[PDB]
Amino acid sequence: QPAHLCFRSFVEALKVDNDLVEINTPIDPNLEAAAITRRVCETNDKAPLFNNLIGMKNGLFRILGAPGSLRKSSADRYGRLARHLALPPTASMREILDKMLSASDMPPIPPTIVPTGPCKENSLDDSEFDLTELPVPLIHKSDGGKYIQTYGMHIVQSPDGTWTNWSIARAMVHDKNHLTGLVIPPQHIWQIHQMWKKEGRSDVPWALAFGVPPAAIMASSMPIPDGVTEAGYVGAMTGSSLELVKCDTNDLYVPATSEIVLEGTLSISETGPEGPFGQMHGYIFPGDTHLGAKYKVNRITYRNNAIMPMSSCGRLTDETHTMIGSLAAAEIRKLCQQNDLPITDAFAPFESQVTWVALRVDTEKLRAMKTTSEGFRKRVGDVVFNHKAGYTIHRLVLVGDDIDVYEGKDVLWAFSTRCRPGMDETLFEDVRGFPLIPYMGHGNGPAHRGGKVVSDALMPTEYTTGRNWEAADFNQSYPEDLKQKVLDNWTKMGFSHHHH
Amino acid sequence: QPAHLCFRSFVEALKVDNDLVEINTPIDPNLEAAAITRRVCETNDKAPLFNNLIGMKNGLFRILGAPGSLRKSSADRYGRLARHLALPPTASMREILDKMLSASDMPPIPPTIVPTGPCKENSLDDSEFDLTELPVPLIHKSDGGKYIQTYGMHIVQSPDGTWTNWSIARAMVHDKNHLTGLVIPPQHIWQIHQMWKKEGRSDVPWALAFGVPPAAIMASSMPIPDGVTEAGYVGAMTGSSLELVKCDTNDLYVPATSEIVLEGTLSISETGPEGPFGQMHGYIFPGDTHLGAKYKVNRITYRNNAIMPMSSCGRLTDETHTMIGSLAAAEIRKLCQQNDLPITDAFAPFESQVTWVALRVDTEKLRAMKTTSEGFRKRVGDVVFNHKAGYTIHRLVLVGDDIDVYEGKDVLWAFSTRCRPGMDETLFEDVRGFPLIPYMGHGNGPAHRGGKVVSDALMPTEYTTGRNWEAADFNQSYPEDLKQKVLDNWTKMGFSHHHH
Numbered sequence A, B: 001q002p003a004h005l006c007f008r009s010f011v012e013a014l015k016v017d018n019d020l021v022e023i024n025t026p027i028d029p030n031l032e033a034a035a036i037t038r039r040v041c042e043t044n045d046k047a048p049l050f051n052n053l054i055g056m057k058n059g060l061f062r063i064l065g066a067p068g069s070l071r072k073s074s075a076d077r078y079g080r081l082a083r084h085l086a087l088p089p090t091a092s093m094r095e096i097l098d099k100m101l102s103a104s105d106m107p108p109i110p111p112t113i114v115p116t117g118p119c120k121e122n123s124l125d126d127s128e129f130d131l132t133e134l135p136v137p138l139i140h141k142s143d144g145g146k147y148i149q150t151y152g153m154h155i156v157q158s159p160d161g162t163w164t165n166w167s168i169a170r171a172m173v174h175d176k177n178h179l180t181g182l183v184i185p186p187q188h189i190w191q192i193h194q195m196w197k198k199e200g201r202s203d204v205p206w207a208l209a210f211g212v213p214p215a216a217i218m219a220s221s222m223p224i225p226d227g228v229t230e231a232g233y234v235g236a237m238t239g240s241s242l243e244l245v246k247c248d249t250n251d252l253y254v255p256a257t258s259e260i261v262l263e264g265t266l267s268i269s270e271t272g273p274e275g276p277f278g279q280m281h282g283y284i285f286p287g288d289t290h291l292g293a294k295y296k297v298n299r300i301t302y303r304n305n306a307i308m309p310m311s312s313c314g315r316l317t318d319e320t321h322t323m324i325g326s327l328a329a330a331e332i333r334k335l336c337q338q339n340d341l342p343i344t345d346a347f348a349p350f351e352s353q354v355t356w357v358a359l360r361v362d363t364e365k366l367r368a369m370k371t372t373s374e375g376f377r378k379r380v381g382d383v384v385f386n387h388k389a390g391y392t393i394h395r396l397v398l399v400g401d402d403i404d405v406y407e408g409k410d411v412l413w414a415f416s417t418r419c420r421p422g423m424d425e426t427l428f429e430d431v432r433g434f435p436l437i438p439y440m441g442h443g444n445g446p447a448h449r450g451g452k453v454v455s456d457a458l459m460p461t462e463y464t465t466g467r468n469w470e471a472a473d474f475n476q477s478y479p480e481d482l483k484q485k486v487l488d489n490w491t492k493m494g495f496s497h498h499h500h
Ligand SMILES: Cc1cc2c3c(c1C)C(C)(C)CC=[N+]3c1c([nH]c(=O)[nH]c1=O)N2C[C@H](O)[C@H](O)[C@H](O)COP(=O)(O)O
Pocket: A149, A150, A151, A165, A166, A167, A168, A169, A170, A171, A182, A184, A186, A187, A188, A189, A220, A221, A222, A223, A224, A311, A313, A319, A320, A323, A324
């Protein structure tokens, strides 16, 4: 099966790419596998595959760390991501994000039901597993539990059957047959949970699938619209209907080639201790346990020699930056265009710990609007900060056409030199805030409200007559024939490769 | 003579360091020398020495570009700066800035007058030079003149004789015997000019010395206090009295080993067109000419085979970032400590285009103050933004003891994750602003007032009981013995030098 449609094939692809290190000697799931993965993420090294995990029994389980993290070379920096999507490994971020948005104006391709698949090779009933006996990792030394769920997909369906959501939300082991996890507004797993709680009759039928088709895990990390079934979006994006098998103990459907599947229920009444967890902004607050949602596990099914993917998340750079930030930015680009705002590109700079999004403006279009900074900032912030796609983002930076928003140095240059603090900004206190940013949930104000800003790094003439400067740089401050002469004589004169 | 006391010896030191490229074939001062230097600055390459400059006659002049710019390796990144100060080439920024501050609590060592020096080897009177016939560079394609003065020292004295100031301010050729340049408040050349204009009797006696002792050009770029003679500060810093010779046509004194000296007057009545100039924030606004101060040149003296240093300034990284930003930050550190604020370190991040300064706080001391963010931000911003040392800086970022302010990635991480926009900030509109930042002089508000902010990236418990988090990073989220095991087995397992 192709790499973007089968996790097992994705792991092969990483090997073939010389982007995997297979570790066949014993590695401890208590901190060691995650420490190695953390180091990989902080250094952009090859992804680790732990084939000999202390505590693995009867096939459960090997671990792949850093599945969506960065490569060291600039030429294939985003290659792991490209390998989730059948794109060449040299694909740009623009190309990855356009691929993720492409299904937004396509008919869905609904999934195909098949009678069996690899995820049925092995099964354990409710008398035969114990989640405390599996090699679940402790990912950070102060975590409040062993976080089994950092790169699987939760599957829940609306009571009426009309919407099946796929999403990533963290969860940890509570006891032999339960997990606890984050289920918070405005996320779709929370929106669906609320529909079942209002009906009041039963717990939510649930599955959690690990090692799913890579194209599916990418859509699971993206804020596609309310009511849109991720499976049909992924089918349109890839051009193929995804093959799904029914769960054994409920009527949900999971990818046929899933590595590991948990089946059970998400309670509409019970909670249990959850967290703390080392998280995407780079922090853990030891001891900050709170009550989370509670999942009951009734059945495990799994592939022979099953592989569990894991995100060792925290400081730069991991899946919580490359996927959460970039895919939110993609959705925000589209949302702005659909609201008739002249936005061409959007990206969440890594330097901002993916808390900012830079919005590149088509300034010819802006000029024809005959507007001002105060008016335009308000319009952009009202659109984005009132929408779910803006949930995680606390600062929007508006920049003109000379800025490449995919280059954090250029975004920081424009922000620092073109946006006057205070006067060129609009603060938004009556919007939903993201409580997991430290300055929100552990800060001086309301954890769930406000703390957002639009910072206008457009210069005044960009609204009127056009850019009135040139950069004081090699590219813009010297004519073409001189530049070329310099470059052609560079190594001649004594001064100092793209792939590497 | 030692490198820090003689520019000619400094050039040798760069050679010996394998940090110079000598270019002995003809190079055009019209853009080509500056384009090569720009490229060097954007790539951290070796400094260029142009020995065959088109238009050089009778010894005037060779050019050294990038005298204070960065080296490519991390281990000697600041080595050019270290070579201005007799420090080892591996000196840290902390060590460089401490050396620059060391004379602040020392008695001055006043200069020594000697009867002659190398700067007297050649002379041209007022019938024998023409500034339009020298190989003065055009540094950026849109500049409003040929900027002779980008790395010399202006010398002016108070009318009462009690203060002799040395400083860098830009100047360009106006005609055969005049320059125009920037002379703006609150700079010491402007403060002295105003004392002569209030007296009303004559133009200001002036000299401009190029290729001065490197330790002297560093103090020329630093905002040491009002009324302090830079020569005696440099003498205390170096432990030696600087040797000076009298000008021929006035009673000012110039370094004996200066490469080139202009003698004349700075008018108290005349102005002439000045600018535009590609400047330290990375911009030029073509056509933005304004009236500047006007200098008359009566005499040129110079060394045999004289060398003119040049800064090809603009986008990162050059002397306007490494010297202006860092030396302002040093002075701000000291100013905060003298006002009893618990600041340990200060640096202007390059990523901010040296418009921010990050202030590291001794949080044990802060806790004993028993204060709040609102109160402490106001106190820090009142001290810094009301003082000349804060002139160029528009955002202060307060950070706790875990942050290395000399590392821009860590400053950006703390700012983005610990400072809630709006609530955790105090805006300052009734302070002097720096008009050369684009969002000031070319922006939406008053060019000369406001636009400043203190952003508090201290977390709430840093004011009360102490840091309550651990980083989600390799260093802090794993025990020491595990970390060491990982590192010792790194290359064994399959994964990937300090000097490089
Ligand atoms: C890539 C990724 C996405 C995580 C994520 C992680 C990763 C690796 C973890 C597991 C390592 C850390 C926690 N995560 C959570 C999370 N969203 C949230 O609600 N709870 C989370 O606990 N997300 C973000 C979430 O997947 C996106 O917001 C989706 O848009 C949610 O899908 P939905 O739009 O269908 O609700």
